[PDB]
Design a protein around this ligand. Sequence first.
Ligand SMILES: N[C@H](CCC(=O)O)C(=O)O
Ligand SMILES: N[C@H](CCC(=O)O)C(=O)O
Ligand SMILES: [Ca+2]
Length: 314
Amino acid sequence: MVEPQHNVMQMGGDFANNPNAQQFIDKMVNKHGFDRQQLQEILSQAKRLDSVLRLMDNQAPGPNGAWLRYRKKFITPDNVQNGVVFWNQYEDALNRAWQVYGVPPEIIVGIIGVETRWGRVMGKTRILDALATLSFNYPRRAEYFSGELETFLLMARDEQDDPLNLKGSFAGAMGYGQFMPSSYKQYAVDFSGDGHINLWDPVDAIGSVANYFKAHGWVKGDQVAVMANGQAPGLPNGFKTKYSISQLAAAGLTPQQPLGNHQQASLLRLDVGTGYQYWYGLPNFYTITRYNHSTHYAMAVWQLGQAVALARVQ
Ligand SMILES: N[C@H](CCC(=O)O)C(=O)O
Ligand SMILES: N[C@H](CCC(=O)O)C(=O)O
Ligand SMILES: [Ca+2]
């Protein structure tokens, strides 16, 4: 009946003679009470995906219209129209997310839109393959991904999912909002109320994105960014920059909208082909970058959300 298989200490597959996989199994058994043989069966099926390693390497750390090209990948009639459909379909969850977390529908709709086109593109790679590959055959970020794999397996166990059935991005991101295992653990919420946190349930995803935003400092009703009149070619730009409003004014900029009580801001510069468009980046813009560290990403999420909000009014 019961087969302990104590003598089966060697697994097959792509990670068969991998020291990192062996150490990982030992950690899961010692730290979390996993059964070595059960874990060996799972990992013997895990695949080493060279494409994952190559993409992770390809992303390792004008005016020619850079922003225009990025923007048009997300802000198109088809995308905006689909965003309207998603918003209307899940309006109750979105409104409830606004009330509980203070994060507006346009922001959540923009995030889910840029991330997966509202569930249309959620990834085709088995999460286990991606995470095992990055944990066992990628020294540069082996520690970060081993932590993600550990959390992934714990998530599967708790939510009673088969670790091998879940698919997502090349980095192991999952569902509507493309949450990493660590984000599921720290920020995902059962917004649908059925007692289970499912990253593939749009209602849960909506609440999880909102909670993620509030946890990262989103200020309800605060401005995201304000476009500037003027140019500031001398000053370095990017979402990580920081200047007092006085410095920016001295550099030749004026806000198109009142900045209120804000005394500092980041200097954002968008390449609009004919020249540059400067913006005063406010705290909420930086909060968007906490989801994906990119000025273009944050601006696309925000503007996509605004475009959908407007298409809804019509
Ligand atoms: N994506 C991270 C970027 C690290 C960073 O520059 O903060 C990596 O590949 O390590
Ligand atoms: N899509 C980005 C480039 C676009 C941009 O952010 O300017 C990439 O894969 O590198
Ligand atoms: Ca749920």
